[PDB]
Each structure stands twice: as C-alpha cells, then as structure tokens.
C-alpha cells in the first residue's frame, strides 16, 4: 500500500538519522537542531540562536525529559501536520 | 523531500477517506471498521465480530469521545508504528 511506504520510510529515515551521533533512538537538542535544518527547513526557518531552540525544545518535550523520544518525535512529526492547515481545499 | 510526500500523502488519503460518509473530519466506528479492513488489513486481521471492534474502539478513544478524531487518528497511525518492532535490523 502507499501508506506502507510512508510508514516504512519514516522508520528507515529516523533510525538512520538517529544513528548519526550519540546512542541510537535518542534525539539530543544539538541533534534536533540538525534534523530541523536538514529535514524541516523548506517550510520553517527562524532558529537563528540556540536560545530560540532551547525555548522550542523545552516546549517540544512534553515530559521535559530534555531529549526528544521516539514517541514524542512522532508528535512533533504530527505537529507539523496539525500545525499546517489544509491548503489543498483551494482550487 | 521524500517525507513531504509521506506527510502530504496521509492528509490527502485521510480527508478523501474521511469524506466517504458522515461529516468530514469525523471517523465513526462503522467508518473505522471500513478503514481497517481496506487500509490496515494485510498486517492485522481478526475483527470478526462488532463486539471485538467495540472493545478496541473504546480502547482506541483516548478521551472516550466515541469517535476517532484527527489528532487521535495520528496516534493510531503511530501505534501501528510503535506496535510493530523494527524487523529491518535482521539481514
Ligand atoms: Ca541520535
Ligand atoms: Ca521529550
Ligand atoms: Ca467520515
Ligand atoms: Ca476518541
């Protein structure tokens, strides 16, 4: 199914991406900054100072674990979905 | 980006699929049964009686709203991700 590739694509991208530095399956704030710059950047910019990341990162951490777990990581992935409104409703 | 198609593919599939019956952006238990049978079926089966759906549906509803909202819908989408363990770690 087309959704199977979408789901499978995310895991393959996450584990390969999460295995860049530090323990696998653990996104650090420094690692989070790299992911946003490389992955989410064409639709969102800003982030010019670490303090801007510290506020967003702490807010991102629902449990305040200081890092972004796989479970929350899916939330942020969804937030990018729930954040953007449907723009395909216009001709 | 390849993730942009994955995200966009989900919304296009959800709104077109959620617009099958009832108000748009509202998944009913009867609608939920159709989605699982058509979308999530090649990896999961069971579901032979409505009572099996009623237990799973009520459990699925984190807030017990009786229906599956777009936000929770993403959870169930993730649950299919967090439910299946990574099998790509084996040669
Ligand atoms: Ca990592
Ligand atoms: Ca966190
Ligand atoms: Ca519907
Ligand atoms: Ca619910």
Ion ligand 2 residues within 5 Å by Cβ: A 61, 65, 72
Q: Does domain A1-91 have CATH number 1.10.238.10?
A: yes
Residues 6+ apart with CB under 8 A from B32: B53, B57, B60, B68
Residues in contact with B85: Cβ distance below 8 Å, sequence separation at least 6, in sequence order: none
Q: Among A11, A82, A86, select the one facing B81 at the smallest CB separation.
A: A11
Residues sharing a CB contact under 8 Å with residue A77, sequence separation 6 or more, in sequence order: A10, B7
* Pick from A2, A39, A71: CB nearest B9: A2
Among all bound ligands, the one having the nearest atom to the CA of A57 is 2
Name the experiment that determined this structure: NMR
Q: What are phi and psi of B19, to 5 degrees?
A: -90, 20
Number of Cβ within 10 Å of residue B53's Cβ equals 18
Q: For A75, left (φ over 0), alpha (ψ -120 to 50), or beta?
A: alpha
Q: CB B6 to CB A11 under 8 A?
A: no
The structural domains of chain A, with segments of one domain joined by +, span 1-91
What ligand has the least distance to the C-alpha of A62? Answer: 2
């Amino acid at each position: 199914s087309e959704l199977e590739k979408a789901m499978v694509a995310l895991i393959d991208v996450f584990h390969q991406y999460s295995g860049r530095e530090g323990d696998k399956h653990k996104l650090k704030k420094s690692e989070l900054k790299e992911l946003i710059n490389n992955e989410l950047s064409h639709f969102l910019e800003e982030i010019k100072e670490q303090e801007v990341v510290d506020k967003v990162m702490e807010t991102l951490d629902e449990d305040g674990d200081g890092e972004c777990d796989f479970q929350e990581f899916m939330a942020f992935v969804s937030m990018v979905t729930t954040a953007c409104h449907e723009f395909f409703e216009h001709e």
